[PDB]
Amino acid sequence: XTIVALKYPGGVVMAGDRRSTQGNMISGRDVRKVYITDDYTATGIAGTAAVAVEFARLYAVELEHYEKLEGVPLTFAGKINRLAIMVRGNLALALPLLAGYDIHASDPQSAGRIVSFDAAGGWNIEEEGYQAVGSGSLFAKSSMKKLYSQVTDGDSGLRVAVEALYDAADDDSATGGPDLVRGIFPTAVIIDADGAVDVPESRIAELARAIIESRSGADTFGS
Amino acid sequence: XTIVALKYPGGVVMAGDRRSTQGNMISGRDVRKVYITDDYTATGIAGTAAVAVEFARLYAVELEHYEKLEGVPLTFAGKINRLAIMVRGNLALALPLLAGYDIHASDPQSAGRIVSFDAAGGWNIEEEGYQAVGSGSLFAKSSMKKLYSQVTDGDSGLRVAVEALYDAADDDSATGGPDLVRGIFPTAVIIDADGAVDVPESRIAELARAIIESRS
Amino acid sequence: XTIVALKYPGGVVMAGDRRSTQGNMISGRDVRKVYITDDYTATGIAGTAAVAVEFARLYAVELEHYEKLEGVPLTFAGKINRLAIMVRGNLAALPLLAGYDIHASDPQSAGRIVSFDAAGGWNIEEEGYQAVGSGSLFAKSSMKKLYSQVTDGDSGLRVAVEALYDAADDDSATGGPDLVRGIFPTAVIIDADGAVDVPESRIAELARAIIESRS
Amino acid sequence: XTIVALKYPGGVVMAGDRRSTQGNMISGRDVRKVYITDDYTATGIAGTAAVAVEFARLYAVELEHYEKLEGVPLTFAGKINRLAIMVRGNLALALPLLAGYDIHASDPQSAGRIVSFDAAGGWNIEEEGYQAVGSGSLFAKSSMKKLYSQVTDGDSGLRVAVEALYDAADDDSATGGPDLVRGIFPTAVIIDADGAVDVPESRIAELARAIIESRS
Amino acid sequence: XTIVALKYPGGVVMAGDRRSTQGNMISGRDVRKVYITDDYTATGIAGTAAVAVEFARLYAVELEHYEKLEGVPLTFAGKINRLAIMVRGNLAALPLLAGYDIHASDPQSAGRIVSFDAAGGWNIEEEGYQAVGSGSLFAKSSMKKLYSQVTDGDSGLRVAVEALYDAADDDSATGGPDLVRGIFPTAVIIDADGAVDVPESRIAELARAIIESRS
Amino acid sequence: XTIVALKYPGGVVMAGDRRSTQGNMISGRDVRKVYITDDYTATGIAGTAAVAVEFARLYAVELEHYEKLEGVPLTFAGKINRLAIMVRGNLALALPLLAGYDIHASDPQSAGRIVSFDAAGGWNIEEEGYQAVGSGSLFAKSSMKKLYSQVTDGDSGLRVAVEALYDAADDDSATGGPDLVRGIFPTAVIIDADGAVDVPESRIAELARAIIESRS
Amino acid sequence: XTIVALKYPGGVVMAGDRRSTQGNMISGRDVRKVYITDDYTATGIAGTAAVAVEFARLYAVELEHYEKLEGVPLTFAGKINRLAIMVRGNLALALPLLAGYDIHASDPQSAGRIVSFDAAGGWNIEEEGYQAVGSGSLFAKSSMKKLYSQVTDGDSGLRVAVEALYDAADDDSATGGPDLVRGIFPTAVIIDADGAVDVPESRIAELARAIIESRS
Amino acid sequence: XTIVALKYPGGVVMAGDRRSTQGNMISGRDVRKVYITDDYTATGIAGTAAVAVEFARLYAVELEHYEKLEGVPLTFAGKINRLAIMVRGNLLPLLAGYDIHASDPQSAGRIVSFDAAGGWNIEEEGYQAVGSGSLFAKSSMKKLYSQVTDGDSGLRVAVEALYDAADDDSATGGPDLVRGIFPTAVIIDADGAVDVPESRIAELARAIIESRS
Amino acid sequence: XTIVALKYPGGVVMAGDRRSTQGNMISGRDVRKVYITDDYTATGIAGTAAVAVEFARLYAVELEHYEKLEGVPLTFAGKINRLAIMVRGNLALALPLLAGYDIHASDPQSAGRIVSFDAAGGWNIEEEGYQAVGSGSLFAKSSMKKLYSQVTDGDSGLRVAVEALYDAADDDSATGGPDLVRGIFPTAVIIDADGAVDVPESRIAELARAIIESRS
C-alpha cells in the first residue's frame, strides 16, 4: 500500500491509496490511511485501516494534551520528538509519514515539512521536496522525480501526488488504483497557513479520471 | 493468476488473465497463458509466460508426434494419459488445465471436456460444467456458480468466462483485470466440432466493456 | 465455520452456522455462534460454542456495566472501542459485530458491521456485507451476486441463509441445514426497535426454499 | 474419505463415498473410488479420483496380462501377492481395500474375500466379516458392528454398507454423505459366483433415501 | 548493477553500467557487461566482468557453430531457445537479450528484447523497454516517463543513458558516469545494417548533456 | 558511511559524508552526521540522521547539565567518561567518534583529542594523529596515512580530511562522495582554542571541487 | 596480545605489549595494558586499551576506598579477594594478571607476588616465579623457562620480561614487537619495598635495541 | 598474506610477502609465494608455501605441455583461459605477464586477478593486490603510482605497498632486518621473466625504513 | 604426543616420545613413532602406534617400489612429492614429519632436510634448522630456539632433541617424559652421508639422565 507527500509553494499535500490485502486477497477497498492530527499536521501509515486510525488518534491526543496543559501547542521539533517516542515505543509493523506546516518558520513559502521513519524507528526530515512510504514507494518516488518540476501550487501538487499513487498502483499489486466502477479514489490532505483540510472527493475524482484519460491517449500514440 | 474453463452446448471455452507478478511487483501485463495444442485441445497454466508456452509446446509436439507415427490422433483418454505422464514427470510449480473436444463422443452437445490437476499430479475430469486454476480460482468458481445457468451457447459461454476472470481480479491482486488504458484483455480459446480457434481480441474487449458498464 | 452479516434498508442481519469440528471429526451440530449483546448489538464468533458464548457474555457485561455506571449507553464508536480493547487483550478466532446506531442521521443506513483482522484491528465495512470463518470467501462471493436482491428485512435474511448454504457447499467445516435433525442456522435481526432473535421456523422455510431451488 | 466392504452369504460388496478435499475445501463430489479389476475382484482406495483409477487400472492390466500369458487367471492368493508387490513398490500414503470372490473355494457361501493394507504396506485378510479404510473408517466399522447381524443376502448386505458410509459421513467431514440436491450417491460393486457387477445408481439412491427417512 | 534495453523505430539499443561490487566495496570501474553475440544480437548480464564475458562467448560460439554446420543462421525463435537451454543449464546469471529479426515482416518493429526471470523462464518484452539488475526498477520507472521521446537511434540512446543515470542516482550498486576517469556506460545499437558498438565519444556527449540539464 | 577526524597543530577537525543506505538503495543525500556538542567538543556517528542527532543531543544536554549544576564544565577525562557510560548503556549499532580540544592541557599545540569506540563499547584515545569510523574507514585511514605529513595547520588538516572522505567514497559504495550536481558536500567541524565552529559549506565546496579537478 | 610478570629477589616486574587487533587488522600500536593500582600493586589485562584501564581504575578505587574508610590498606590476601570478587562479577572476556609486593611478608626477598585468573574466574598465586597471559602466553612462558636462571635482580628481571615479550611477538602475530620506526616499546612496572614505579620508556628502548642487536 | 602486481612503462612487476600463519601463530618466515611459470608469466598466491608452489608447478607444466605439442606457446588470452579452467576446477591467484604480441610494447604488461567465484579480471587500473593486506596495499599504490616511470621505481612502489600491508595487517610479514628476509619479486619485460636479486629488494626495503623513521 | 627434528652440521636427527592417550588415560608407554623409511629418510607421526607404523610402512614400500622398477632411487624432491600425494589421499588425524639427507646436494654439511605438513596437507621445507609436530610442538620449538646455538655435531644435536622432548613433556600431559622406573626413553634416528641408523637406547638413556640431573 502507498502514501505520498510533497511540498509545494506555500504548503504540503499528503495522499494515500485505499487498498488493504491479506496475502494475495484484497481485504479492503475504502481504507483511509491519512488523517489530520492537529491544525497543522497529518499522518499517514501504509498499513491496515486500524493501524492508521489508531496511530493518528493516539498522536492527536498527545498533541492536544500538551496544548490544554501548557496553553500553547508544541513547536514543530517537539511534535516530531513526541512522534518519534511513540514510534520507538511500539517497536516491542508499518512506519508513519508525517506532513506538517511550521507556522513559526521564517519563510512561509517553504514552511511545509515532511518527516519519515526508517526500520529502526529513526526520524528523517525530507529535503528533496517529496517522499513516499509503503510497498509502492519506489515507483511513486521515481514518478515524482520526473514530475516534481511541474508543482507550482496546491492543485498542481495534489495532481502530482495522485499521479504518483497511480504509478505506484500500475507497478505494485498491493497499492490500489482509482476504482472508476465503485467511485473510490485516493484520500488527501492539504496543509498551508490556514490549517489542515481534507481535500474533497470531487477534485481527486476529477484528477484521477484526467490522469487515466491522459494515459489512455499516450498509449494509443505510442502503438 | 487465473485460468477458467467452461462447457457450453456444443463445445468448450478456456480463458486466462494477463498478469504475472514477482511478489508484490507486476512483472508482466501481456502474458499469454492459454494455447491451442492440437485441432481439438487447449492448455492453460496459471504461471509465468515461459512455463505456459513451454508446457503447451512440449505437449503439442507429443500429440502431433503420435499422429505422424501412427496415422491417427490419440483418443481423448490417451491425450489425458500423455498429459498426466508429462505432468507427473515434471513433479520431480503450477498445475495445468486442459480443455478439449471429444470428436469421438456419442453426444456432440456435451462432447466438451475439462481436465484439471491436483498438487500430487492427479488428473480430474470435471463434471460440474466449469473449473478454474490459480490464485483467484475460488473467486472465479464462485462467480461461475451463480452465472452458469446463463450459458446457452458459445457467446454466453464466452461472456461468463470473462465475467469469472473479472471477479477473480476484483478479489485477488495476483490476477489482472481488463486494462482499458493499454487495451489489454484476457485471451480465450473456443473449441467445438470445427476445431479450436483463438477468440478475436475485439470480441473479448466488447464483452469486457459490457461487464464494466453493467457494474457501474 | 461461517458467520455472515448484511445491511438492509432499515437495519442489519447476522447469521451463523451450527457446526464445530475437531480436525476432521464433527464435534457439534447445535452450536450457537451468534448472540445479542445489548439492545442494539450482536456478536458472532466462528469458533466453538464456548468461545462464542464466553466472548459475548463478557462483552454484554461490559456494555451494561457502562450503562449502569453512567446512566446512558456507549455511543457506537465507544462500543467498538471497548470490543477492540477486549480482542487485543485476548491475543496476548476473531469476532464479527452487527449493530444499529440509534444516533445516526439517516435511519435507513444506520446498520453497522464491524470485523477484525489477524492483528486485532477493527474495520467498519462499507460494502454492505461481511463474513468470517473457514467458509467466508465462499459466502462473500455469493453475497456479491445476491446483494442487489436485498430490499427489506426478509429478503435480507434470505440472502444471509443462502450465503451460509453456499459456504457449506464448498467448505466441509461449515454446516449446512440438517433436514433430518431439524437444525438450521441461527440469526439475529437489528433495526430501530432493537435486536431480536429470528424464529427457527422462518429460517427453516427459507432454507427449505433455497434447497428446492437448487434441486 | 471412506471405503467399506462386507461379506454376505454368497458373496461380497464394496462401497465408497464421493467426496475429495484439499484441506477444508471440497474439491470433488463425483469421485469414483471403487473399480472392478477383473471378473472376480474390485479395488477401493480412500484417496483422490486419480490415485483410485490409476491404481485399479495398473492392477487390472497386471491380472489380465497374466491370464493372456498363461491361459488361466491367478489363484486368489496370487492376486493378493501381486497387489502386495504393487503396494510395497509405491510406498518406496493411501492404502487399498480389495474385495474378491474365490471361485476355487470349497464353500461357495463364504467364498467372499476382503483384503486390506496397512501403513507399512502389509496385507490383511479380514475375518471379522467387514472392513473399512479412510478418515471415517472407525465410524463405519463401529456402525457395521451393530448392523452386521442384519446381513442375510446381497440386498441386506448392500443396505448395511450404505448405512455404514452414511454414519461415516455423519461424524467425519472428509467423507461425503448422499447429496439429495445433486443426486450423487455412493458407488458400489457386488461380487458373487456370477462375477463382479456395478450396482445401479438407482438402487443405492433408494437405500440412501430409506436410511434418511428412517432417521427423521 | 544495471543493464537497460529499448526498442526504437528501426532497431534496438542496449546499455550497461561499469561498476562491480564485493559487498559494499567497489571492485571494478571498467566492467563491460554488454557484448555483441552475432551479427544481429547482443547479450547483457548484470554480474561480474567474468560472468558477462564468459556467457556471451559461449552463446556466440553456439550461434556460429550452428551457422557453420547448417549453412544458415538460426531464426530469432531458435536463438532464444538456445539461450534458454543455456540459462536453465547453469541454474542447475539472468541475461537480457537484444536483437533484430532480419526476417520479420515490418522492419521498423523488428527490434526484440528478451529477459529471464528467477526460474530461468524467457519473456519477450512488448512494452518497448526492459532493465535487469539492482537498479532495474529505477531505470524502468525512468524509461516509463521518457519513452515517448524515443523517435530514432540517437534519442533511443539518450533515454538509455538517462535510465542508467537514474539507476545510479538511486542505487549504490550501479555506477554513474565517472567524469574524473572518463569512464561511461557501454552500448550496442542494432538496426537493419547489423549490430555495432556505440563509440565512447557519443555516450560521453549524452552523459555530459544529462548532467548539465540536472544541475 | 564514513566519519574522519584528525589532529593538526593547535587543534582538531572532524568531517563526515552525507549518504545513508537501506541495503543497496540510497535513502539519504543530506545526512548530517557531525554535531558540535559543547564549546570544545563534537561527535560523529556513522549511522542514520536520527541516530547521529539523537546521540549528539543527549550528550550535549548531559555536558551542559553538569555545567549548570556545578558551575564549571567537566574536565576532558570526565567528558569521555560520561560518553562511555552513555555508549555502554545503549548496547544493553554504530559507534561514535569524539573530537575535542582539552583547554587544560599543558601543550596547546597537541591539545586536540580524538576518541573512538570499539564493538564492546570501549573508549580509546588515538595517538596516531587521525582516525575514521564506518564502512569506508580502512580506505580513509590508509589515505590519511599517506597524506598526514602535509598537515601543518587547520586548512591543511581540513584538506586531508575531505580527501580521506573522497577516497572512502571512491572505494566504498555506502559512503557518499561530493555531489557536484546537487551541490551537497561533506560537513565538517574545526575545534581550536577559540572553540568549536561549523566549517562553511563554501570552503568544503572549494576543497572538494579541487580534489576532483586534481584527479582529472 | 601478551602480558608477562616475574619475581626477582627483592620484588616483581610486569610488562605488556602495545598492539591491539580486530581479527587480522592492527587497531592499536600504543595500547597501555599495565597500570599501577596502589602503592604496591599493578594489574595487566591482555585486552583492549579500554578494558585494561577501566578494570585498573575500578580496582584502584576500591583499594583506596577501603584505606580511607578503615585507615589502613587491605592485606595482600584481602586485595586478591576483592579482585576475585570483581572478576567473578564481570564474568557473570579477558583474564587479569596481578603483580604485587607483600609489605607484611616475613622474608622481603621473596615478598613479590604474582596472581593470575583462569577461564572460570579462579585465582592462582604463581609459585614458579613467572607467569604470562594472552595469545602469546605459551611462547613467553616457554622463553622465560630458559631465561629465568638469569634473573638475579630488578634489572635482569626487566631484561628477561622484555625478551619474553619479544619472543611472544616473534611467534604470535597478535602480540606487537618493539617498533623501532615509531619508537614504541612495551610498558613496564617494577614493584619493590619502596613501592610501584613505571619503568622509563628510554630504559625499555635500550633493552629492546640490545636484544635486537644480539640476535643479528 | 599479500601479493602485489603493477604495470610500469615496458613491463610488469609482481612481489609477495614471506609470512604464513596458522590462526595467530607465525608458521613461516621464508615463504616464497611468487613463481615464474613460463618465459613471460608469473603467478602469485596469497596462501601457504605448498599451495603457491603446487599451483605454479601445475600451470607451468600446462603451458609447456601445449608448447611441446603445438610448437608455439599459447597467446596471452589462451594462458588466462587455461588458468581459469584450473582455478574453477580446484574450487585466488594473481597472474602477471608480458604480451609479446601486443601492438604497443610500452603497455604490454598484463595483470589478471580472480574473484571468489573463480572469475578472471584483467586489471586496467595499473596495479592490483590479493590477500589479507590487499586493501592496504592498493590504497598505498593509489597514492604512489604516479611515481612509477620505469622498472626500478616500479619495484620500489611494489615493496612500499607490501610494507604498508604489513604495517596494518598482522597476517602480512614486513622486512625482517634481523634475519635478512625480504619480499620476493619477479620483473617481466620484452626480454622475459627474471627473479629480482635479494640484494636489490634489501636496498629498497632499507631505504623505505630510513624514510619512515 | 611430540616428534622433533633438527639439522646438525653433516646430517639430521629425529626423535619422538613414547606415550599414547585415550582422553586423559595413558594407553601406551612403549609407542614407537619414528621409523626409517629408506636408506636416507625417516618419518615420524604424532599419533597412535598403528598410524605411525602403517604410514611409514606404506611410504617405505612406495620408495622401494620405485627403486626396483626404475633402478635408481627417487630424488629428494620426488620423495616429498610422493609423500604429499599419500598425505592428501588420506585426508580426503595426525600430520607427518620427515627427516632426510639429500645425497645429491652440493653442500654436504647442510644436506639434512626436514619436511612438515600443515592441516590442509601442504608440505613445507624447514629453513629454521628444526621443527616439531604434535600436542607439545610449541614447547619443543621454543626450547630448541634457545638451545639451537649449542648444536655443533650429531651428539650435540641428539642431546638438544632429547631436551626439547623433555620440555614438551614438562609442559604437555599428552607427551611422555623419560620413565626412569620402567627404563623407557624417546626413540631416535640419525641420518648422515652413511645412511639412516637407529640411535641405541643406551645413548638416549645416558642423555636423558644427564638432562634430569641437570634440572634437579
Closest to H135 (Cβ–Cβ): which among F138, F146, F147? F138
User: What kind of fold does domain H2-213 have according to CATH?
Assistant: Glutamine Phosphoribosylpyrophosphate, subunit 1, domain 1 (3.60.20)
I180 Cβ contact list (under 8 Å, min separation 6): I209, I212
Beta strands in chain C (DSSP E): 2-8, 11-16, 20-22, 25-28, 34-38, 41-45, 95-100, 111-116, 122-124, 129-133, 186-191, 194-197
Please report the sign of the dihedral spanned by the C-alpha atoms of residue B57, residue B59, residue B65, residue B70.
negative
Q: What is the DSSP string of H17-52?
A: ---EEETTEEEESS---EEEEETTEEEEESS-HHHH
F2-216: CATH number: 3.60.20.10
Q: What is the DSSP string of chain G?
A: -EEEEEEETTEEEEEE---EEETTEEEESS---EEEEETTEEEEESS-HHHHHHHHHHHHHHHHHHHHHHSSPPPHHHHHHHHHHHHHHHH--PPEEEEEE-TT-S-GGG-EEEEEE-TTS-EEE--SSEEEEETTHHHHHHHHHHHGGG--SHHHHHHHHHHHHHHHHHHBTTS---BTTTTB--EEEEEETTEEEEPPHHHHHHHHHHHHHHH-
C-alpha cell at E18: 561499469
Angle formed at CA A80 by CA A75 and CA A84, multiple of 5 degrees: 145
Q: Which amino acid is at D78?
A: G
CB contact (8 A) between residue I138 and residue G143: no
F26, F29, F48, F187: best mutation site toward chain A, by most A Cβ within 10 Å?
Answer: F48
Q: What is the DSSP string of C114-176?
A: EEE-TTS-EEE--SSEEEEETTHHHHHHHHHHHGGG--SHHHHHHHHHHHHHHHHHHBTTS--
Q: Which DSSP symbol is given to H103? A: S
Q: Which DSSP symbol is given to A121? A: S
Q: In chain G, whose CA is at the least distance from the CA of F88? A: G50
Partners of C145 on chain B (C-beta within 8 Å) are: 143, 146-147
Closest to F143 (Cβ–Cβ): which among H139, H144, H168? H139
SS3 I197: strand
In terms of Cα–Cα distance, which of I96, I105, I109 is closest to I5? Answer: I96
**C160 φ, ψ (degrees, to nearest 5):** -70, -40
CB contact (8 A) between residue H119 and residue E30: no
- G104 burial via Cβ count (<10 Å: 0-12, 13-18, 19+): exposed
**How many beta-carbon contacts under 8 Å exist across E and H?**
22
Give the Å distances, CA to CA, from I37 to D55, F156, I58, I188, I191: 68, 69, 9, 13, 11
Buried b (16+ CB within 10 A) or exposed e, C161-191: bbbbbbbbbbbbbbbbbbeeeebbbbbbbbb
Q: What is the DSSP string of G13-55?
A: EEEE---EEETTEEEESS---EEEEETTEEEEESS-HHHHHHH
Q: How far is D109 from chain B (nearest CA, A)?
A: 39
Interface of B with C in 154-173 (CB under 8 A): 167, 171
Distance, CA of C25 to CA of A124 (rounded, Å): 55
Asked whether the beta carbons of D125 and D140 are under 8 A apart, the reply is no
Distance, CA of A47 to CA of A93 (rounded, Å): 8
Asked whether the beta carbons of H98 and E31 are under 8 A apart, the reply is no
Radius of gyration of chain F (CA): 16
D54 in contact with B, Cβ within 8 Å: yes
Asked whether the beta carbons of B176 and B18 are under 8 A apart, the reply is yes
Q: How far is G26 from chain H (nearest CA, A)?
A: 5
Angle formed at CA I141 by CA I140 and CA I145, multiple of 5 degrees: 120
Asked whether the beta carbons of I34 and I3 are under 8 A apart, the reply is yes
- C44 burial via Cβ count (<10 Å: 0-12, 13-18, 19+): buried
Distance, CA of F109 to CA of F112 (rounded, Å): 8
Q: What is the CA A81 to chain-centroid distance, rounded?
A: 19
CB contact (8 A) between residue A219 and residue B182: yes
- The H or E element containing residue I143 is helix I137-147
Distance, CA of C76 to CA of C104 (rounded, Å): 9
G138, G145, G170: best mutation site toward chain I, by most I Cβ within 10 Å?
Answer: G145
Q: What is the DSSP string of I85-101?
A: HHHHHH------EEEEE
CB atoms within 10 A of CB B122: 21
How many alpha carbons lie under 13 Å from residue A97 in its C-beta half-sphere? 26
Question: Beta partners for A188?
Answer: A15
Longest dimension (CA), chain I: 55
CB atoms within 10 A of CB G178: 23
**A107 φ, ψ (degrees, to nearest 5):** -100, 110
- I179 burial via Cβ count (<10 Å: 0-12, 13-18, 19+): middle
B139 in contact with C, Cβ within 8 Å: yes
Q: What is the dihedral of CA G158, G163, G166, G170, to 10 degrees?
A: -170
Q: Which DSSP symbol is given to B209? A: H
User: What kind of fold does domain A2-223 have according to CATH?
Assistant: Glutamine Phosphoribosylpyrophosphate, subunit 1, domain 1 (3.60.20)
C-alpha cell at F169: 567514497
Q: At what angle do helices A76-89 and A49-70 cross, to 10 degrees?
A: 130
Q: Which amino acid is at F151?
A: V
**Domain map of chain C by residue range?**
2-215
Distance, CA of I16 to CA of I187 (rounded, Å): 6
Partners of E134 on chain F (C-beta within 8 Å) are: 24
Distance, CA of D80 to CA of D94 (rounded, Å): 17
Distance, CA of A143 to CA of A161 (rounded, Å): 10
Asked whether the beta carbons of F98 and F78 are under 8 A apart, the reply is no
Distance, CA of G151 to CA of G144 (rounded, Å): 10
After which residues is chain I discontinuous, taking C to N > 2.5 Å?
92
Residue whose C-alpha cell is 626436514: I114
Distance, CA of B162 to CA of F107 (rounded, Å): 87
Angle formed at CA G18 by CA G13 and CA G19, multiple of 5 degrees: 140
SS3 C191: strand
In terms of Cα–Cα distance, which of C32, D168, F22 is closest to A116? Answer: F22
In terms of Cα–Cα distance, which of G102, G131, G139 is closest to G115? Answer: G131
CATH superfamily of E2-215: Aminohydrolase, N-terminal nucleophile (Ntn) domain (3.60.20.10)
B201 in contact with E, Cβ within 8 Å: no
- G106 burial via Cβ count (<10 Å: 0-12, 13-18, 19+): exposed
Asked whether the beta carbons of B1 and B20 are under 8 A apart, the reply is yes
Q: At what angle do helices I76-90 and I49-70 cross, to 10 degrees?
A: 130
Buried b (16+ CB within 10 A) or exposed e, I180-209: eeeebbbbbbbbbeeebeebeeebbbebbe
Counting CB pairs under 8 A, whether chains D and C reach 3 or more, is yes
Question: Beta partners for H169?
Answer: G25
G180 in contact with H, Cβ within 8 Å: yes
**How many beta-carbon contacts under 8 Å exist across F and G?**
26
Closest to A122 (Cβ–Cβ): which among F25, F29, F51? F51
After which residues is chain E discontinuous, taking C to N > 2.5 Å?
92
Q: Which amino acid is at E66?
A: Y
CB contact (8 A) between residue C171 and residue D25: yes
SS3 E33: coil
CB atoms within 10 A of CB B106: 7
Q: Which amino acid is at C126?
A: E
Asked whether the beta carbons of H139 and F139 are under 8 A apart, the reply is yes
In terms of Cα–Cα distance, which of G122, G135, G144, G123 is closest to G6? Answer: G144
Give the method used.
X-ray
Please report the sign of the dihedral spanned by the C-alpha atoms of residue H150, residue H152, residue H157, residue H161.
positive
Asked whether the beta carbons of H126 and H5 are under 8 A apart, the reply is no
Quoted resolution (Å):
2.5
Distance, CA of B56 to CA of B71 (rounded, Å): 22
D30 in contact with B, Cβ within 8 Å: yes
Asked whether the beta carbons of A114 and A123 are under 8 A apart, the reply is no
CB contact (8 A) between residue A142 and residue E141: yes
B150 in contact with D, Cβ within 8 Å: no
- The H or E element containing residue H7 is strand H2-8
Closest to A118 (Cβ–Cβ): which among F22, F29, F54? F22
- A106 burial via Cβ count (<10 Å: 0-12, 13-18, 19+): exposed
Counting CB pairs under 8 A, whether chains A and F reach 3 or more, is yes
Distance, CA of D134 to CA of A222 (rounded, Å): 61
Question: Beta partners for F13?
Answer: F6, F190
Question: Beta partners for B184?
Answer: B179
Neighbours of chain I (3+ CB pairs under 8 A): G, H
Give the Å distances, CA to CA, from H23 to B46, G23, G24, G174, H170: 54, 10, 9, 10, 11
Q: At what angle do helices H151-168 and F137-147 cross, to 10 degrees?
A: 120
CB atoms within 10 A of CB D78: 12
H89 Cβ contact list (under 8 Å, min separation 6): none
Asked whether the beta carbons of E41 and E98 are under 8 A apart, the reply is yes
- The H or E element containing residue E114 is strand E111-116
Asked whether the beta carbons of B186 and B162 are under 8 A apart, the reply is yes
C-alpha cell at D93: 500414503
Give the Å distances, CA to CA, from C203 to C146, F157, H25: 17, 88, 86
G145 in contact with I, Cβ within 8 Å: yes
Q: What is the DSSP string of I14-25?
A: EEE---EEETTE
Residue whose C-alpha cell is 603467478: H43
Distance, CA of D6 to CA of D113 (rounded, Å): 9
Partners of A218 on chain E (C-beta within 8 Å) are: 148
Question: Beta partners for I100?
Answer: I41, I113
Distance, CA of G122 to CA of G85 (rounded, Å): 10
CB contact (8 A) between residue C25 and residue D172: yes
Q: How far is D31 from chain B (nearest CA, A)?
A: 9
Q: Which DSSP symbol is given to E183? A: B
Distance, CA of I101 to CA of I11 (rounded, Å): 6
Give the Å distances, CA to CA, from H130 to C214, D126, H127: 78, 75, 11
B144 in contact with C, Cβ within 8 Å: no
C110 in contact with B, Cβ within 8 Å: no
Asked whether the beta carbons of C5 and C13 are under 8 A apart, the reply is yes
CB contact (8 A) between residue G50 and residue F138: no
- The H or E element containing residue H202 is helix H198-212
Please report the sign of the dihedral spanned by the C-alpha atoms of residue G61, residue G67, residue G69, residue G74.
positive
Radius of gyration of chain G (CA): 16
CB contact (8 A) between residue E180 and residue F215: yes
Question: Beta partners for F100?
Answer: F41, F113
Neighbours of chain B (3+ CB pairs under 8 A): A, C, D, E
**How many beta-carbon contacts under 8 Å exist across A and B?**
42
Q: Could you write out the three-class secondary structure of chain F?
A: CEEEEEEECCEEEEEECCCEEECCEEEECCCCCEEEEECCEEEEECCCHHHHHHHHHHHHHHHHHHHHHHCCCCCHHHHHHHHHHHHHHHCCCCCEEEEEECCCCCCHHHCEEEEEECCCCCEEECCCCEEEEECCHHHHHHHHHHHHHHCCCHHHHHHHHHHHHHHHHHHECCCCCCECCCCECCEEEEEECCEEEECCHHHHHHHHHHHHHHHC
Radius of gyration of chain H (CA): 16
Counting CB pairs under 8 A, whether chains A and G reach 3 or more, is no
How many alpha carbons lie under 13 Å from residue G8 in its C-beta half-sphere? 24
Radius of gyration of chain B (CA): 16
Asked whether the beta carbons of E123 and E114 are under 8 A apart, the reply is yes
In terms of Cα–Cα distance, which of C69, C58, C67 is closest to C40? Answer: C67
Asked whether the beta carbons of D15 and D4 are under 8 A apart, the reply is yes
